[PDB]
From Swiss-Prot:
It is linked to White-Kernohan syndrome: An autosomal dominant disorder characterized by global developmental delay, variably impaired intellectual development, hypotonia, and characteristic facial features. Some patients may have genitourinary and skeletal abnormalities. It holds the Pfam family Beta-prop_RSE1_2nd. The modification N-acetylserine is found at residue 1. Pathway: Protein modification; protein ubiquitination. The gene is DDB1. Protein, which is both involved in DNA repair and protein ubiquitination, as part of the UV-DDB complex and DCX (DDB1-CUL4-X-box) complexes, respectively. Core component of the UV-DDB complex (UV-damaged DNA-binding protein complex), a complex that recognizes UV-induced DNA damage and recruit proteins of the nucleotide excision repair pathway (the NER pathway) to initiate DNA repair. The UV-DDB complex preferentially binds to cyclobutane pyrimidine dimers (CPD), 6-4 photoproducts (6-4 PP), apurinic sites and short mismatches. The lineage of its organism: Eukaryota, Metazoa, Chordata, Craniata, Vertebrata. The core of the protein consists of three WD40 beta-propeller domains. It comes from the Eukaryota. Component of the UV-DDB complex which includes DDB1 and DDB2; the heterodimer dimerizes to give rise to a heterotetramer when bound to damaged DNA. The UV-DDB complex interacts with monoubiquitinated histone H2A and binds to XPC via the DDB2 subunit. Component of numerous DCX (DDB1-CUL4-X-box) E3 ubiquitin-protein ligase complexes which consist of a core of DDB1, CUL4A or CUL4B and RBX1. DDB1 may recruit specific substrate targeting subunits to the DCX complex. Residues 348-648 are annotated as: WD repeat beta-propeller B. This is DNA damage-binding protein 1. Phosphorylated by ABL1. InterPro entries: Beta-prop_RSE1/DDB1/CPSF1_1st, Cleavage/polyA-sp_fac_asu_C, RSE1/DDB1/CFT1/CPSF1, WD40/YVTN_repeat-like_dom_sf, WD40_repeat_dom_sf.
Length: 1011
């Protein structure tokens, strides 16, 4: 195995959210598996980090003498973190494994408690910088939930447990490393949630189905409101504990209100229906704003009024239950569940919604303009030795038309400016006339020009002049003579700039000069013999950069200090043609990189680059007209005006189904998708399967949806039989038959299945062409050399399709526990078992039977399988690991991925081969192959990167990537994510890794192009 794995889409499902004071600031922290996102509540993003672990626990807490952050991963890495140029420093770390997960922190910060295993409670006393823990044995072996109580002299836990449900308390003594007698209580049969109520109340609230109880050493309520659905999350609104939000498995939002000598006791409890949200994994009141963190659908900000109003939606692709690639190249996912169910159509790059196109060749520059003293109404265009003005063709008074314009626009004191190769022209507004004209003393040609609203700097060979724009006056402030010819200039004020950026011929430097002086603050030799073509100073977020494009397509960029002029730190290649850089706004600042590979540059806290979906753009400008409210773009022959999609790497389109999609397959001849779905009927709401144009027949109700490939309209829905679950889908032709079918495999499911069907359909409507009753669940189906291969419990069967439109068994394979997965290549079949890993079959065409070629004898609970090639078989299993196999299958590659894979398919949104995969967390990845020689180089690089990069938990990358079920170093796999991070680290760290730095940049740049 020489395989390489990389993230195409980071995980999007929310697994945890908390509020606190981590960075006076109110923070939202969010866990998305391997990512921790940190926001300031205004949500202003501040920092995202990747951990080398799956986040299991995430708790903020303030010891005596800002909140610190405790994290635990699913591999039991424990750390205490501090936010401190942003750093997350590790205050304490250690591994707390013993030879789901619940983590809780005492309110007086005396200790951390962990429920990792039945029958043990692990305590980390809070200086143990190594986070040494001890175990206490708990006699109650099945703990449902546990919390630390608030009003207590000794640290006291309160928990629900199940035995042949009860609430008990214990004191946790650090002297005795043991429990003490804590009040106790039998409680509701489905009590599943403990809430420690703060002072003045103290005590605990217990959430069941149908029941809510408070205890402090009766009181209970049983509101009919809450029995219809299970409450899955709760959140404290007031510090008092007087109000709590609660969320259900249907997205209903409740408030729970506590009615309050000289103490305060609980008088009563009330529950009130607030409204509907996405199905919440977590809830955090911000301030009446609530963050709804979702696993099964999109997350949200909602407003609570004096009842719920959604402010913002955040894309969650998870769970990705199935997907396919269709043309080019686009990914269509079965996404989410229940009322959140959807299709997502995922495409690389940024699109342009073109609103006007004009036949105009030779455009050599482009400027927007306001002729009326707030919207642009004019577009000025440049040509070789010429200028033309467009109204939104016209003529502007004051402007020349028989010289080339180098810059023009709106300037200080209600004026316009035009700079040409001959002079700088200042033009009044009311009316329009030449009010000032600057020329070089000997009337030599202006060669390069830059301009803001107040300042002008122009070059004349090696000479620079700094002008200021005054009421009816171009005032020459200063000048100088550069050492080489000036190549490019910028004076973007980061509205008066104390700085000039320049690029020179001959020495190929980028310089930062002071204004008015022209003192050098910084020189950078850029290397080579190609000149800088564009140069630009820019603010992204609240950070300042120099950007500098060469004539060959290379782009250098640097952090920049306004006060110092210092350039620090990176190269990237964007096209082969010279890049022209232009700023535009879309909310935020962005730079358009005009070339044969057009590109937006944006900001992470790190410059990102995303392909614009045009063939070529030579020049562009932003355009806020009344008619085109936008961008203007110019190639060799057209002037385009349009809108641009959101600035982001993946464009995602959502088709809501309002029920659960399960399988998808494309049918090219029909120009449609077939999609299996199920809805819960009690029908709860309208959903895709109840809203089709046509429908046919013949708790969970399953359907086959026919969905238009262009509009994504539900054209037809076929309902299955009562108690019939649809499990497998194929679109194919069979035998000599020229027709293309949707074929479905089912299971009749009664309170494993012993009955099922295979149904052949043809698509305005869906006719049933053939059925075949079978003696089990039809878990998997795949077309196989014009025959139908099917898995039915522990049987793998091959059917032929006869002249009389029936399926007829040809052969069977029996040596499985449960054949869940099937992939095919040529005459070879890859079988994934429920518990016995992977099996390689061969159809023997001359004998009409199967032959087992090889088997992997390691038990593996499979989630998905793929054939990488004739001799290499990929597996994903239930403990988040990938493996590759080659009469024994040898396990030659092993990798801890950290995600649960539901689907693999061959394809690309743009090494040998390309398999994308979809995940429970909505992460999308890619697996590809390498030569021994690329592997060896990149393994070595991985090892060097690991020695140089600081990991946030102080977790070892080798540990994190170790194959682990109920452990072994990763082998034959490159962590592509680690590799790509080489482009983000500092210049000296890059040099530290390298013992050229720029030669590895070219290697990693090539690797980023595969997705």
């Amino acid at each position: 195995s020489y395989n390489y794995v990389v993230t195409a889409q980071k995980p999007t499902a929310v697994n945890g959210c908390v509020t606190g004071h981590f960075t006076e600031d109110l923070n939202l922290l969010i866990a998305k598996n391997t990512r921790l996102e940190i926001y300031v509540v205004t949500l202003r993003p501040v920092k995202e980090v990747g951990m080398y672990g799956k986040i299991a626990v995430m708790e903020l807490f303030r010891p005596k003498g800002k909140d610190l952050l405790f994290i635990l991963t699913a591999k039991y890495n424990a750390c205490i973190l501090e936010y401190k140029s942003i750093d997350i420093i590790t205050r304490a770390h250690g591994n707390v494994q013993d030879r789901g997960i619940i983590g809780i922190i005492d309110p007086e910060c005396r200790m951390i408690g962990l429920r990792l295993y039945d029958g043990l409670f692990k305590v980390i006393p809070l200086d143990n910088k190594e986070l040494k823990a001890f175990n206490i044995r708990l006699e109650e072996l099945h703990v449902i939930d546990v919390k630390f109580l608030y009003g207590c002299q000794a640290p006291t836990i309160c928990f629900v447990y199940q035995d042949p449900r009860h609430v008990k308390t214990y004191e946790v003594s650090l002297r005795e490393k043991e429990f003490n007698k804590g009040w106790k209580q039998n409680v509701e049969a489905e009590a599943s949630m403990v809430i420690a109520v703060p002072e003045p109340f103290g005590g605990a609230i217990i959430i069941g189905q149908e029941s809510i109880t408070y205890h402090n050493g009766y009181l209970a309520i049983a509101p009919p409101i809450i029995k219809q659905s299970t409450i899955v999350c709760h959140n404290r609104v007031d510090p008092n504990g007087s109000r709590y939000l609660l969320g259900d498995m249907e997205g209903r939002l409740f408030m729970l209100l506590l009615e309050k000598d000289g103490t305060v006791t609980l008088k009563d409890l009330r529950v009130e229906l607030l409204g509907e949200t996405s199905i919440a994994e977590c809830l955090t009141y911000l301030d009446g704003v609530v963050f709804v963190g979702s696993r099964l659908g999109d997350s949200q900000l909602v407003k609570l009024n004096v009842y719920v109003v959604a402010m913002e939606t955040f894309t969650n692709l998870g769970p990705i239950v199935d997907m396919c690639v269709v043309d080019q190249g686009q990914l269509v996912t079965c996404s989410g569940a229940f009322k959140e169910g959807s299709l997502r159509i995922i495409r690389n790059g940024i699109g342009i919604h073109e609103h006007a196109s004009i036949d105009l060749p030779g455009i050599k520059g482009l400027w927007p303009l306001r002729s009326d003293p707030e919207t642009d109404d004019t577009l000025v265009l440049s040509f070789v030795g010429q200028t033309r003005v467009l109204m939104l063709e016209t003529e502007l008074m004051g402007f020349v038309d028989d010289q080339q314009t180098f810059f023009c626009g709106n300037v200080a004191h209600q004026q316009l400016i035009q700079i040409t190769s001959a002079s700088v022209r200042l033009v009044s507004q009311e009316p329009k006339a030449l009010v000032s004209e600057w020329k070089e003393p000997q009337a030599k040609n202006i060669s390069v020009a830059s301009c803001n609203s107040s300042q002008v700097v122009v070059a004349v060979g090696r000479a620079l002049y700094y002008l200021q724009i005054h009421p009816q006056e171009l005032r020459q402030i200063s000048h100088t003579e550069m050492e080489h010819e000036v190549a490019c200039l910028d004076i973007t004020p980061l509205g008066l700039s104390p700085l000039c950026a320049i690029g020179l011929w001959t020495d190929i430097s980028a310089r930062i000069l002071k204004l008015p002086s022209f003192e050098l603050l910084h020189k950078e030799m850029l290397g080579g013999e190609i000149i800088p073509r564009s140069i630009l100073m820019t603010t992204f977020e609240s950070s300042h950069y120099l950007l500098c494009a060469l004539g060959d397509g290379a782009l250098f960029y640097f952090g920049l200090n306004i006060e110092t002029g210092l350039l620090s730190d990176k190269k990237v290649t964007l096209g082969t043609q010279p890049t022209v850089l232009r700023t535009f706004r879309s909310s935020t600042t962005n730079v358009f990189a005009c070339s044969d590979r057009p590109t937006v540059i944006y900001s992470n806290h790190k410059l990102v680059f995303s392909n614009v979906n045009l063939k070529e753009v030579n020049y562009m400008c932003p355009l806020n007209s009344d008619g085109y409210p936008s961008l203007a773009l110019a190639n060799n022959s057209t002037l385009t005006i349009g809108t641009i999609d959101e600035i982001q790497k993946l464009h995602i389109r959502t088709v809501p189904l309002y029920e659960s999609p399960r399988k998808i397959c494309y049918q090219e001849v029909s120009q449609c998708f077939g999609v299996l779905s199920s809805r819960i009927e009690v029908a709860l709401r309208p959903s895709a399967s109840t809203q089709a144009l046509s429908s046919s027949v013949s708790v969970e109700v399953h359907n086959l949806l026919i969905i238009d490939q262009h509009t994504f309209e539900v054209l037809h829905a076929h309902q299955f039989l009562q108690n019939e679950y649809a499990l497998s889908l194929v679109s194919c032709k069979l035998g000599k038959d020229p027709n293309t079918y949707f074929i479905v495999g089912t299971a009749m499911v009664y309170p494993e299945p012993k009955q099922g069907r295979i149904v052949v359909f043809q698509y305005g409507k869906l006719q049933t062409v053939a059925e075949k009753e079978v003696k089990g669940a039809v878990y998997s189906m795949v077309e196989f050399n014009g025959k139908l291969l099917a898995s039915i419990n522990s049987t793998v069967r091959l059917y032929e399709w006869t002249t009389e439109k029936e399926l007829r068994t040809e052969c069977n394979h029996y040596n499985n526990i449960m054949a869940l997965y099937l992939k095919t290549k040529g005459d070879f079949i890859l079988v994934g078992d429920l518990m016995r890993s992977v099996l390689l079959l061969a159809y023997k065409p001359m004998e009409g039977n199967f032959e087992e070629i090889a088997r992997d004898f390691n038990p593996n609970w499979m989630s998905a399988v793929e054939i990488l090639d004739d001799d290499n078989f990929l597996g994903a299993e239930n403990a988040f690991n990938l493996f590759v196999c080659q009469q024994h299958l040898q396990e030659v590659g092993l990798f801890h991925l950290g995600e649960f894979v539901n689907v693999f398919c061959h394809g690309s949104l743009v090494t040998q081969g390309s398999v994308l995969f979809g995940t429970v967390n909505g992460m999308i990845g890619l697996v590809t192959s390498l030569s021994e020689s690329w592997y060896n180089l990149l393994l070595d690089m991985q090892n060097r990167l690991n020695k140089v990069i600081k990991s946030v938990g102080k977790i070892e990358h080798s540990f994190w990537r170790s194959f682990h079920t109920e452990t072994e170093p990763a082998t034959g796999f490159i962590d592509g994510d680690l590799i790509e991070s080489f482009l983000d680290i500092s210049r000296p760290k890059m040099q530290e890794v390298v013992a050229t730095a720029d030669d590895l940049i070219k290697v990693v740049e090539e690797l980023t192009r595969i997705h």
